[PDB]
Amino acid sequence: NSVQQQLEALEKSSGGRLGVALINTADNSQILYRADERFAMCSTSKVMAAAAVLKQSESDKHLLNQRVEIKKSDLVNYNPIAEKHVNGTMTLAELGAAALQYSDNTAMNKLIAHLGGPDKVTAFARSLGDETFRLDRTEPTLNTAIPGDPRDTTTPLAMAQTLKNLTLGKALAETQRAQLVTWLKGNTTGSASIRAGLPKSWVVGDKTGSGDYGTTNDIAVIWPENHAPLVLVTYFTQPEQKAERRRDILAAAAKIVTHGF
State the SS3 of 161-199.
Answer: HHHHHHHCCCCCCHHHHHHHHHHHHCCCCCCCCHHHHCC
Does 208 belong to an annotated binding site? Answer: yes
For residues 65 and 68, give the distance between their C-alpha atoms in angstroms, rounded to a whole number.
Answer: 10
| Contact call for residues 153 and 38 (beta carbons, < 8 A) | yes
Closest CA relative to residue 154, chosen from 181, 136, 176, 172: 136
Peptide bond into 140 cis (omega under 30): yes
CA 236 – CA 229 distance, rounded (Å): 23
**169 CB burial (10 A radius; 0-12, 13-18, 19+):** middle
What sign for the dihedral angle of Cα 69, 71, 75, 80?
positive
User: Under a CB-based contact definition with an 8 Å cutoff, are residues 125 and 136 in contact?
Assistant: no
- Identity (one letter) of the amino acid at 8? E
- Distance CA(41)–CA(140), nearest Å, equals 12
Domain ranges for the chain? 1-261
As a 3-state breakdown, the chain gives helix, strand, coil percent values, each rounded to 5, of 45, 20, 40
Give the whole-angstrom CA distance, residue 107 versus residue 203.
26
C-alpha dihedral sign at 174, 175, 181, 184: negative
Q: Tell me: domain 1-261, CATH 3.30.70.580, correct?
A: no
Q: Which residues carry out catalysis? A: 43
Distance set, CA 66 to CA 31, 62, 184 (Å): 41, 7, 21
What size, in residues, is the chain?
261
The candidate with the shortest Cα–Cα distance to 171, out of 123, 122, 134, 128, is 128
Query: Would strands 215-223 and 203-211 be described as parallel, antiparallel, or unpaired?
Result: antiparallel
129 is annotated as contributing to ligand binding: no
Distance separating alpha carbons of residues 129 and 165, to the nearest angstrom: 10
207 is in an annotated binding site: yes
Q: Please, are residues 21 and 38 in contact by the beta-carbon 8 Å criterion?
A: no
User: How large is the angle between the packed helices 46-57 and 92-101, nearest 10 degrees?
Assistant: 150
With contact defined as beta carbons under 8 Å apart, do 74 and 106 qualify? yes
Residue 255 burial by Cβ neighbours in a 10 Å radius (0-12, 13-18, 19+): middle
